[PDB]
């Protein structure tokens, strides 16, 4: 569950958080000519709290 997801960034820290500060500074400085955005994965999660009623009711 959680450990493997954090390992491959399925659900966890965003791109800049886990990368080294030197790396993010270098990426910011050189993004004009040498981009490295694709190289690192950004996790995207959906909210699982008080969004959809779990009871029984009709959509339409």
């Amino acid at each position: 569950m959680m450990p493997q997801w954090a390992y491959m960034h399925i659900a966890g820290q965003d791109a800049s958080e886990y990368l080294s500060p030197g790396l993010v500074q270098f990426a910011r400085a050189t993004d004009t000519y040498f981009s490295m955005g694709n190289k690192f994965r950004n996790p995207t999660v959906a909210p699982t709290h008080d969004v959809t009623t779990d009871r029984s009711q009709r959509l339409m």
């Binding site: 009871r55 029984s56 009711q57 009709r58 959509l59 339409m60």
Partner: protein, 49 residues
Amino acid sequence: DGTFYLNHTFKKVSIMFDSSVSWPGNDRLLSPNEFEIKRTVDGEGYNVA
């Protein structure tokens, strides 16, 4: 290559979990237990477009 051309040939889709419960169930659809993609010959009132 992704050039699919036979999507309209489907009639309905039924999902069962653990062979007992239905997805999504919870009476979330007009036909709660299946997914009626298209409904020909019929037409009691559940067609669009």
